[PDB]
Amino acid sequence: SAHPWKAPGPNDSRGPCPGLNTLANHGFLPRNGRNISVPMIVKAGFEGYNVQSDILILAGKIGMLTSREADTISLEDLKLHGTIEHDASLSREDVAIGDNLHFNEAIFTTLANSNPGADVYNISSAAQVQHDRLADSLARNPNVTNTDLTATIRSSESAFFLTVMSAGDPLRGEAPKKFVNVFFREERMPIKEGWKRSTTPITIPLLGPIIERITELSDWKPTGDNCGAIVLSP
Amino acid sequence: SAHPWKAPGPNDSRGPCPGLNTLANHGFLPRNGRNISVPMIVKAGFEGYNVQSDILILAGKIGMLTSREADTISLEDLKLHGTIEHDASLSREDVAIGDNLHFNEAIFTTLANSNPGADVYNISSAAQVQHDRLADSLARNPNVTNTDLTATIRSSESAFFLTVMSAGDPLRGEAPKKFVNVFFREERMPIKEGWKRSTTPITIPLLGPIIERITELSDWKPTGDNCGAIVLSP
Ligand SMILES: *[C@@H]1O[C@H](CO)[C@@H](O[C@@H]2O[C@H](CO)[C@@H](O[C@@H]3O[C@H](CO[C@H]4O[C@H](CO[C@H]5O[C@H](CO)[C@@H](O)[C@H](O)[C@@H]5O)[C@@H](O)[C@H](O)[C@@H]4O)[C@@H](O)[C@H](O[C@H]4O[C@H](CO)[C@@H](O)[C@H](O)[C@@H]4O)[C@@H]3O)[C@H](O)[C@H]2NC(C)=O)[C@H](O)[C@H]1NC(C)=O
Numbered sequence: 001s002a003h004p005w006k007a008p009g010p011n012d013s014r015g016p017c018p019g020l021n022t023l024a025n026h027g028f029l030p031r032n033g034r035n036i037s038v039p040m041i042v043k044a045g046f047e048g049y050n051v052q053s054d055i056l057i058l059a060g061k062i063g064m065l066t067s068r069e070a071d072t073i074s075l076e077d078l079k080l081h082g083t084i085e086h087d088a089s090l091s092r093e094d095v096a097i098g099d100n101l102h103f104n105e106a107i108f109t110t111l112a113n114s115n116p117g118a119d120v121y122n123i124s125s126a127a128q129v130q131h132d133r134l135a136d137s138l139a140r141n142p143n144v145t146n147t148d149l150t151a152t153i154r155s156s157e158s159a160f161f162l163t164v165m166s167a168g169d170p171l172r173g174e175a176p177k178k179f180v181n182v183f184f185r186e187e188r189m190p191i192k193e194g195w196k197r198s199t200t201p202i203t204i205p206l207l208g209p210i211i212e213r214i215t216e217l218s219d220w221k222p223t224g225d226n227c228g229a230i231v232l233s234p
Numbered sequence: 235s236a237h238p239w240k241a242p243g244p245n246d247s248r249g250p251c252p253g254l255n256t257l258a259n260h261g262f263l264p265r266n267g268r269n270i271s272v273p274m275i276v277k278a279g280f281e282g283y284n285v286q287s288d289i290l291i292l293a294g295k296i297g298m299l300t301s302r303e304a305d306t307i308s309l310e311d312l313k314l315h316g317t318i319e320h321d322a323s324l325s326r327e328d329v330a331i332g333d334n335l336h337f338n339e340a341i342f343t344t345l346a347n348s349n350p351g352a353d354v355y356n357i358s359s360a361a362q363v364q365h366d367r368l369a370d371s372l373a374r375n376p377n378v379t380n381t382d383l384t385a386t387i388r389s390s391e392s393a394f395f396l397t398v399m400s401a402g403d404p405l406r407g408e409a410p411k412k413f414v415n416v417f418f419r420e421e422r423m424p425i426k427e428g429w430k431r432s433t434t435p436i437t438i439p440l441l442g443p444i445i446e447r448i449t450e451l452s453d454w455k456p457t458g459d460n461c462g463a464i465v466l467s468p
């Protein structure tokens with residue numbers, strides 16, 4: 001009960017990111033999800049997950065674009081479509097055809113059914129999930145955006161769940177299904193289930209080869225103009 | 235003299251922006267040009283120029299992308315091509331064929347020679363300068379990037395000099411050449427010359443119509459892909 005999980009209430013701003021929502025649900029970020037700066041994210045990700053400042057500064061400062069404040073966000077601000085938030089999410093619907101903010105079990109069923117027969121999700125299953133989620137958006141969302149940039153972000157996010165939710169060695173690029181499923185469905189660290197914070201720092205160099213391998217295995221191709229333009233403010 | 239002008243020394247960081255360079259040269263920002271946050275920019279723009287937080291937050295957080303630090307920059311970081319820094323600057327060269335950081339009088343000649351006959355720069359002369367600057371980059375720089383985004387940034391920068399360096403009413407969209415020329419060439423507030431800080435707040439809604447008019451008068455068209463992708467980190 002240092003950093004216990006407590007379910008968020010109506011007082012609590014939450015976003016499209018399970019990583020940050022979980023940190024807030026354990027009080028590594030403010031539980032109300034407000035007034036969050038990049039230094040706060042940096043410290044929270046290190047304390048909660050052993051994720052290092054390199055990736056969190058890079059993504060954090062892009063995230064700051066989504067608010068109207070000088071140096072902070074509310075977590076829900078991160079839903080802003082086209083800054084980071086993208087189509088073919090693992091657990092959220094595409095904004096053109098649904099709710100791009102909240103966990104969605106119908107969408108999540110693709111990830112939950114992946115790597116059949118195994119007790120982990122891994123790099124090859126993550127790649128197949130990405131391929132299938134993108135195929136679903138291509139089929140059902142006429143306004144889909146799929147670019148080099150969104151594809152990179154998507155593989156990054158798969159690498160993030162694989163490493164932060166791992167069972168001992170984030171380099172392996174695999175994580176127990178029981179941990180990953182709690183993380184997405186509950187936005188809770190699966191401590192009773194047996195998860196522990198990584199004892200290896202999770203950095204850009206550690207992630208990079210995992211990201212590239214997921215991409216390579218996903219049989220990806222760009223759509224439309226393939227323009228990597230982001231939304232720069234609300 | 236609470237904020238006297240002093241020349242930057244060899245170790246004081248300066249960037250491609252006359253606005254921020256000038257604030258630093260008067261001590262409204264740190265004279266060394268380092269460890270500058272968005273709140274510092276907001277307060278310095280207000281004190282120095284009566285520019286309000288809406289525009290400075292917007293632009294400031296984009297500028298924060300250009301460093302590796304969590305919530306600050308050095309001014310020189312802002313030279314990072316393709317975040318904000320762009321080709322067809324009013325006083326710098328294009329990075330592919332020259333120095334995109336320091337004031338260059340040969341580039342500035344176009345602006346300095348504009349609105350012939352008159353003692354002010356105005357919206358129509360700013361538009362003609364933009365047109366001519368972009369023509370120069372189209373002719374001489376094979377790697378030119380010219381998009382909806384760069385063109386908007388350019389018109390915004392024109393509107394910034396026109397309003398901040400005005401003879402006291404920024405809504406007029408005109409500024410004494412004597413003040414504007416000092417601002418660019420020296421990065422100094424032209425106080426001895428008779429300028430004073432606007433008594434009218436300079437805001438997004440004050441700027442916006444000026445920006446659109448400059449763009450409308452500049453006979454602009456896009457080049458290439460017309461992709462507004464920015465560089466998101468060094
Ligand atoms: C992410 O995890 C996935 C899943 O764990 C990893 O993929 C698996 O890798 C293991 C190797 O570590 C492979 O095991 C080998 O399987 C060989 C037989 O493969 C064929 O048969 C499989 C079974 O038949 C299935 O049919 C359908 C599938 O359509 C199923 O629904 C049905 O229930 C049957 O199960 C097929 O799934 C597969 O495609 C092949 O057709 C065995 O020959 C091999 O045995 C050798 O090795 C053993 C030790 O490893 C040894 O004890 C034996 O003596 C023998 O020498 C071994 O068991 C799995 O095939 C493979 N599964 C998949 C789905 O690819 C994946 O590598 C991992 N990724 C990363 C990056 O880590």
Ligand SMILES: *[C@@H]1O[C@H](CO)[C@@H](O[C@@H]2O[C@H](CO)[C@@H](O[C@@H]3O[C@H](CO[C@H]4O[C@H](CO)[C@@H](O)[C@H](O)[C@@H]4O)[C@@H](O)[C@H](O[C@H]4O[C@H](CO)[C@@H](O)[C@H](O)[C@@H]4O)[C@@H]3O)[C@H](O)[C@H]2NC(C)=O)[C@H](O)[C@H]1NC(C)=O
Nearest residue numbers: 349350351352353354355356357358359360406407408447
């Ligand atoms: C940005 O700043 C520029 C420069 O100041 C402005 O451009 C000038 O705008 C004024 C309008 O105010 C123009 O002045 C007008 O010029 C007309 C044409 O003048 C030339 O041609 C005639 C022959 O046809 C000659 O007689 C003359 O000497 C010039 O060679 C004149 O016909 C107009 O004269 C009438 O109006 C004035 C009062 O304005 C009366 O004094 C006259 O008696 C007569 O009734 C007038 O002089 C000037 O031409 C513009 N210059 C240029 C280069 O375009 C931009 O408008 C301004 N932009 C913005 C957005 O504010």
Ligand code: HEM
Nearest residue numbers: 016017019045060063078084085086089090091092157160
């Ligand atoms: C701290 C470690 C972090 C972890 C483990 C993590 C994990 C993830 C995961 C797995 C997703 C994918 C959700 C999905 O596809 O349904 C995601 C999405 C997202 N993350 Fe993070 N994240 C972290 C940090 C960040 C940071 C620092 C930011 C920005 C400040 C951020 C912003 C987002 C956004 C905007 C999305 C939504 C993208 C989308 O699916 O459309 N995350 N995150």
Ligand code: HEM
Nearest residue numbers: 250251253279294297312318319320323324325326391394
């Ligand atoms: C405070 C009021 C400001 C004023 C009056 C101002 C003014 C200007 C002007 C006139 C230019 C054009 C220089 C040229 O084309 O040669 C410029 C360029 C630039 N400004 Fe500012 N600016 C201000 C604030 C900002 C802020 C807040 C940022 C980012 C944190 C910023 C970043 C830049 C950059 C990167 C350039 C270079 C663009 C280029 O010409 O390639 N400026 N500024």
Ligand SMILES: CCCCCCCCCCCCCCCC(=O)O
Nearest residue numbers: 017058059084152153156157160466
């Ligand atoms: C080898 C460099 C990769 C190519 C360029 C990628 C630089 C921008 C990456 C944006 C990272 C944002 C993803 C953070 C994870 C999240 O979204 O939860």
Ligand SMILES: CCCCCCCCCCCCCCCC(=O)O
Nearest residue numbers: 232251293318386387390391441445
């Ligand atoms: C105020 C007009 C621009 C706002 C339109 C939204 C698209 C992003 C705008 C970027 C504004 C950047 C201005 C920076 C100031 C500077 O460059 O000197």
Ligand SMILES: *[C@@H]1O[C@H](CO)[C@@H](O)[C@H](O)[C@H]1NC(C)=O
Nearest residue numbers: 034035036069070072073074
């Ligand atoms: C917290 O965030 C609110 C908006 O959510 C903002 O107005 C305010 O700046 C923040 N509180 C502070 C700085 O104490």
Ligand SMILES: *[C@@H]1O[C@H](CO)[C@@H](O)[C@H](O)[C@H]1NC(C)=O
Nearest residue numbers: 329330331375376377378379
């Ligand atoms: C610059 O322009 C030429 C086309 O004229 C191209 O071949 C080259 O790749 C470009 N350089 C960069 C860095 O894009």
Ligand SMILES: [Mg+2]
Nearest residue numbers: 085086087089
């Ligand atoms: Mg999404």
Ligand SMILES: [Mg+2]
Nearest residue numbers: 320321323326
């Ligand atoms: Mg430039």
